[PDB]
Design a protein around this nucleic acid. Structure first.
Ligand SMILES: [Zn+2]
Ligand SMILES: [Zn+2]
Lengths: 72, 195, 930, 195
RNA sequence: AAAAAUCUGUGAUUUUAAUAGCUUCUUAGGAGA
RNA sequence: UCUCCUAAGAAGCUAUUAAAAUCACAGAUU
């Protein structure tokens, strides 16, 4: 189950980079910190919280229309 | 299939040679005709060195070229739809992770409460939410505390779309804002902070 | 106990004392010595039994006794030596001599009382700072505490600060040591004064460090023999040669600096256009090292051979910490182009070597060809001279200019996710809870500032001296390893380029790659190289980030050395490089193949011949950043030693100033700014691996010489090494020109035991354990001590291993574990990677194209070749790491064949003509050829 | 295949043999002349084959020479282009050397030589300064004028990492730059200018 | 905008060596017109 | 005086296998 988070975080970071988050020199550093902490950890308890923190930023950058599809 | 006929003629020549050599038991002394048959069969066989070689080379070249074309046509199609592919992959992966936390977060996001989309998120201790309707407001907040994610946040200031700033209502239990929902317009912008 | 003896020892000093011995009996203490006589030789640590010691005490203002460090030592000797020392002290009464006092306490006891000596002499300080181990460190803490070198000291300070001994993790370290500078400066000056006094009074004898009390006063005269007044021969050949590294580890000569620098307010007023400091290094040398009995040429132009060059560069490295930093680098001159003035180089001024002037000079140019235009453009002297000044406080390195485009930030990208294989692996059961193959080796991004944050790690490179005697003998022994290789210069037509489509550095990279610049007619490449032997051609260097799988989170960088460097360094070095690559069964492993039964040959050749073997290994923390400059120069000279006939000495000096100006002191161009590289090897420089290997051999030989010199030769059981050790000290210190008849003997001893296997930075050695137990060979703890003062790093034991049981093979060499498996009915070693790396190089890919599995089928065929030996592994969870790859290649081929039918074609011939998804193709890659 | 002259001779020999073997049947088999005709045809075929092989082997030399000359032409063209580009770059970077300052910098030199590191320090008029932290800005900027070494500088602009621009805030004593806010991304690249 | 080297696979061109075969001149052995 | 078969030398042409060299792509290590 840990590998699932460690593999979802990389694709999430790829999506955020494709969304042109590198323009901000403050948000990018915080996101990189979260991503590195998720990758370098072992306890899924911390990885899940850090992944949720990363995901909170996704809505702010771009209100993805697909937000209503994952529910079902 | 154009190469098979050469194989058929070679086999026919070999069979004829076998038949003539088996029937011609006297060929041991009269080996002239036996040698002639052997040489004719050999000439029939020799066609392979040319026909099979050319066929194999041409087929290999054509297959290489066509495979390269197919690989290019596949990689270009893969690259054509990058961002939508990334979204689909991310959602398919999130579906795999069984965690009620992310499900609750996504349900709340679909409800109508999301970051303000401006003043980008920069720290782990601040947010800015929008609460569309009184129903989700009552569902989420409780007096001074709100729970957007699994964590509990503390409210600092509340603003209305017109810019007027709201204030809490005195009550024995504690500060409250619910009554103001039915008397003021929507939506409300709430500046949170980590607890 | 007796009180009369103490009362007499008190003398007229009028000071309080407390006995340490139980009476007239002597006292036993552990002190370092420097002995060389008809029976022993070395820098050993032996017990002292000839002297009784009393401690002075004083009354503090608070009314409590303070146990000051002033000691009274009362040595006891025979009447003959008593009279001899009395007569000697009749002279040499100057202020630099500790106040003696001669008396006889009883009819049979003779005393030579020395008053107010400090506890530890100079030799104890030098020895403790040299042979440093973090579990017997009292001799150094008791010196640092007393002389107030830790300003915030409070009881049990060392308990809270657990990493006070780490040069690269305690930012205050060097600022903690620098407060010892005055003591060493005083020691040197008092040594010179005492030498002059001895010469005047006419005494011939040997002076060493243990003679000098820490206050700086000499305190015993047993060995001196009188001679005619006005004619004396003091010898300090081993006083200076042992403390040489500590004069620059503690910044002894700081009060001599010619400039005052504040990190925020810049240099104070000083002479800005003076470059020739040749007339001041000589004065400093005569002021401090007056009794050094060898010549010293400030400029390395005049040096006679590649040994005097090292000897003088060692001094220049110390004396160049005082010259202002805005005075080194390229010189320049004013010339004209059709009447339009501009700047062009006219020499070079290097920290380690000295001033060199070009042998050709011109003051006009027109119709310039391609070679001259390239020389002008690539030379920084015209770019740095026409751009805005730069001052950035992010880095400690000097910053000389900023390009027109300004400073710009560059980031790194994350790695893609190859789900098409992750799902298959999960279906096969690779990833499950409690697995023995956790995921590691991810793709790590970096923020904006990484480009310079990583380059800032050059602050670990500091100017370090070497003790020239030991370093020179170690160089002579090391050069014996490279005695069976070809060497020389080759013409242009014979050069060979591995790959031609690669960047040509700055600014050439704008117009094309190396292919475009290699089209120059050979008559022009030859002219360029020949004119490099009579000129100095400085060039710019880029610093570009790297992007590859890595477990460590830190970033990486590689230097893109410009084409004007490689184009000539290839012609210079390629012959010996290709001779190193085409040799087998030698300490240098570069060029040997891991497949086809090569690994077993290397391992069974390393182990053969050594009695009672016990392998080991070592790791250099930050080798690229922290490599001292003098060792890089030594490696370059060791590789250039083979030009006996093709080049004269002067050309071999100009070539070394070209290598130094192009690699060791680059004008780095990192992130829109031009800096000055302090030192250390650049990864992208030509012949980096071979220079690293030579440096490794030098370090491994020093780690053995130092340990072999520091043992009590009186108590060596073996009668063959008991004489080799005695001869080694005399051959190293008490002689000027090395003796090959002994260098060969010592190299034979060092190759019979302590075998070696080296590849750039990696290494392994199987050393005779019985000797290493007695201290006659450099075991693991014998490398940390040498790295402490020859590399300025602490080699933590967590980075080293030891494998006494040979049958299990090396723990890890070249990042591949070794295992023993029967092949063809005999036991042979096989390598096998870390399965996490193989498993996590298929899931993550560095480009979007590679995520399409069908298009890169060859990636898994090349990955399954290297992961085969995991089939023999006992752990059942590692065989899947290979069978899954086989099944995946089968699946890829089947999918491609089925999918290609949409084009109305059948690939059945090639499909069934594939042997790659079977075990036979790979199993034959680890079997010795017939 | 028919281009080589020997093919015509081979065809002529074939025709002659075919005609003679049929014309000589009047006298019977006549092995004496039949063997001579066979040998003549055999020699003709051997000579034709040898000449064809020699010509085919010699053919490739023309293609090799054409490739060589084409490569030479392309390499000389690329060399010309590269030389033009290098000349343009050199004459572009050499156009902004103020001869006036260079005429005084070398006046004070030790025999007309000055280390390269001190050309921009005595000739330039703008200092690009980079500040990575407020703890350094407070200790370096010193209001609006930055003093480095001995000279006194001014400030022309202040640019942050994002690429935006900070602006001064007027006060009673004079202009100042607002620092230590949470909305400025470090480092700050300050472009000074000599007084 | 992506450095200096070593090793190993796959595909394309050329030469060499061997195997099999074809055509030809010569010599030698067996016999035939 | 000529002809068939057989052995060898030599010349040319076909293919199959193995090695070397050049060119292109891809992995691993320092
Ligand atoms: Zn010298
Ligand atoms: Zn040479």
């Amino acid at each position: 189950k840990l590998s699932d988070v460690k593999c979802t975080t990389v694709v999430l970071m790829q999506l955020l980079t494709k969304l042109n988050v590198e323009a901000n020199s403050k948000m990018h550093a915080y996101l990189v910190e979260l991503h590195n902490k998720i990758l370098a950890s072992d306890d899924v308890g911390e990885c899940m919280d850090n992944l949720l923190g990363m995901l909170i930023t996704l809505f702010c950058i771009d209100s993805t229309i697909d937000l209503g599809e994952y529910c079902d | 299939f154009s190469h098979i006929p050469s194989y058929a003629e070679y086999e026919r020549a070999k069979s004829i040679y076998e038949k003539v050599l088996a029937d011609s038991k006297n060929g041991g002394v009269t080996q002239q005709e036996l040698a002639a048959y052997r040489k004719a069969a050999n000439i029939a066989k020799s066609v392979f060195d040319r026909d099979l070689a050319v066929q194999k080379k041409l087929d290999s070249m054509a297959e290489r070229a066509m495979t390269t074309m197919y690989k290019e046509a596949r990689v270009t199609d893969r690259r054509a739809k990058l961002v939508s592919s990334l979204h689909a992959l991310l959602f398919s992966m999130l579906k795999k992770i069984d965690s009620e936390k992310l499900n609750v977060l996504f349900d709340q996001a679909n409800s109508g409460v999301v970051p303000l989309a401006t003043v980008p998120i920069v720290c782990s201790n601040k947010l800015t939410l929008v609460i569309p309707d009184p129903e989700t407001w009552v569902k989420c907040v409780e007096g001074v505390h709100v729970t957007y994610s699994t964590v509990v946040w503390n409210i600092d200031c509340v603003t209305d779309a017109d810019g007027t700033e709201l204030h809490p209502t005195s009550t024995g239990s504690g500060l409250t804002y619910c009554i103001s929902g039915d008397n003021i317009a929507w939506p409300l912008k709430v500046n949170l902070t980590r607890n | 106990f007796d009180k009369n003896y103490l009362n007499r020892v008190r003398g007229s000093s009028e000071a309080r004392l407390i006995p340490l011995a139980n009476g007239c009996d002597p006292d036993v203490v552990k002190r370092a010595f420097d002995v060389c006589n008809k029976e022993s030789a070395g820098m050993f640590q032996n017990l002292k039994r000839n002297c009784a010691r009393f401690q002075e005490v004083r009354d503090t203002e608070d009314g409590n006794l303070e146990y000051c460090d002033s000691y009274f030592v009362v040595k006891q000797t025979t009447p003959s030596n008593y009279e001899h020392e009395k007569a000697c002290y009749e002279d040499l009464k100057s202020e630099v001599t500790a106040d003696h006092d001669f008396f006889v306490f009883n009819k049979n006891i003779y005393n030579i009382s020395r008053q107010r000596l400090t506890k530890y002499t100079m030799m104890d300080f030098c020895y403790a700072l040299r042979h440093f181990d973090p579990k017997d460190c009292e001799v150094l803490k008791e010196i640092l505490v007393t002389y107030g070198c830790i300003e915030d000291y409070h009881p049990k300070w060392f308990e809270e600060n657990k990493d006070w001994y780490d040069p690269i993790e305690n930012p205050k370290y060097y600022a903690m040591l620098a407060k010892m500078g005055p003591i060493v400066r005083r020691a040197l000056l008092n040594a010179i004064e005492f030498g002059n006094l001895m010469v005047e009074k006419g005494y011939v004898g040997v002076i060493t460090l243990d003679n000098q009390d820490l206050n700086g006063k000499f305190y015993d005269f047993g060995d001196f023999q009188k001679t005619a007044p006005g004619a004396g021969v003091p010898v300090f050949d081993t006083y200076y040669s042992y403390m040489m590294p500590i004069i620059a580890m503690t910044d002894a000569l700081a009060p001599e600096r010619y400039f005052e620098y504040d990190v925020h307010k810049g240099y104070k007023s000083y002479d800005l256009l003076k470059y020739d400091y040749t007339e001041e290094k000589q004065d400093l040398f005569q002021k401090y090292f007056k009794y050094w009995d060898q010549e010293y040429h400030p400029n390395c132009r005049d040096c006679s051979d590649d040994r005097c060059l090292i000897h003088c560069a060692n001094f220049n490295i110390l004396f160049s910490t005082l010259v202002p930093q805005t005075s080194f680098g390229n010189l320049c001159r004013k010339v004209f182009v059709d009447g339009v003035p501009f700047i062009a180089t006219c020499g070079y001024h290097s920290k380690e070597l000295g001033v060199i002037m070009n042998q050709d000079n011109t003051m006009s140019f027109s119709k310039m060809g391609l070679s001259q235009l390239m020389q002008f453009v690539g030379d920084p002297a015209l770019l740095v001279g026409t751009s805005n000044k730069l001052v950035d406080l992010r880095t400690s390195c000097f910053s000389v200019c900023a390009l027109a485009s300004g400073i710009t930030h560059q980031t790194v990208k994350p790695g893609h996710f190859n789900k098409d294989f992750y799902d298959f692996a999960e279906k096969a059961g690779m990833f499950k809870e409690g697995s023995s193959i956790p995921l590691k080796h991810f793709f790590y991004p970096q923020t904006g500032n990484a480009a310079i944050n990583d380059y800032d790690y050059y602050r670990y490179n500091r100017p370090t001296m070497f003790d020239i005697r030991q370093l020179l003998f170690c160089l002579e022994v090391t050069s014996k390893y490279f005695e069976c290789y070809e060497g020389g210069c080759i013409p242009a037509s014979q050069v060979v380029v591995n790959n031609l489509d690669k960047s040509a550095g700055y600014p050439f990279n704008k117009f094309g790659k190396a292919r475009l610049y290699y089209e120059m007619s050979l008559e022009e490449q030859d002219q360029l190289f020949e004119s490099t032997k009579k000129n100095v051609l400085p060039t710019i260097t880029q610093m570009n980030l790297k992007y590859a799988i890595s477990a460590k989170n830190r970033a990486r960088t590689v230097a893109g050395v410009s084409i004007l460097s490689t184009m000539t360094n290839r012609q210079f070095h390629q012959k010996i490089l290709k001779s190193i690559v085409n040799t087998r069964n030698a300490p240098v492993v570069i060029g040997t193949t891991k497949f086809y039964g090569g690994w077993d040959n290397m391992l069974r050749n390393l182990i053969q011949g050594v009695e009672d073997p016990i392998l080991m290994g070592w790791d250099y923390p930050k080798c690229d950043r922290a490599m001292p400059n003098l060792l890089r120069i030594a490696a370059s000279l060791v590789l250039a030693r083979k030009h006996t006939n093709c080049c004269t000495w002067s050309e071999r000096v100009y070539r070394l100033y070209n290598e130094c100006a192009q690699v060791l002191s680059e004008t780095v161009l990192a992130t829109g700014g031009i800096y000055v590289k302090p030192g250390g090897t650049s990864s992208g420089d030509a012949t980096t691996a071979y220079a690293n290997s030579v440096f490794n051999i030098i370090q491994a030989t020093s780690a053995n010489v130092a340990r072999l010199l520091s043992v009590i030769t009186r108590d060596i059981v073996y009668d063959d090494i008991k004489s080799l050790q005695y001869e080694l000290y005399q051959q190293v210190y008490r002689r000027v020109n090395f003796d090959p008849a002994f260098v060969e003997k010592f190299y034979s001893y060092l190759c019979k035991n302590f075998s070696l296997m080296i590849l750039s930075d990696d290494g392994v050695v199987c050393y005779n354990n019985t000797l290493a137990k007695q201290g006659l060979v450099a075991d693991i703890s014998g490398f940390r001590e040498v790295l402490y003062y020859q590399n300025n790093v602490f080699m933590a034991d967590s980075k080293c291993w030891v494998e006494p049981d040979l049958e299990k093979g090396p723990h890890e060499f070249c990042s591949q574990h070794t295992m023993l498996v029967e092949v063809d009915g005999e036991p042979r070693y096989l390598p096998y990677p870390d399965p996490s790396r193989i498993l996590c190089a298929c899931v993550f890919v560095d480009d979007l194209d590679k995520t399409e599995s069908v298009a890169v089928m060859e990636r898994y065929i090349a990955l399954a070749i290297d992961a085969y030996p995991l089939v023999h592994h006992e752990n059942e969870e590692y065989k899947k790491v290979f069978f899954v790859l086989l099944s995946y290649i089968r699946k890829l081929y089947q999918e491609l064949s089925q999918n290609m039918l949409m084009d109305y074609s059948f690939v059945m011939d090639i499909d069934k003509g594939s042997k790659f998804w079977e075990q036979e193709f790979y199993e034959n890659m680890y079997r010795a050829p017939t």
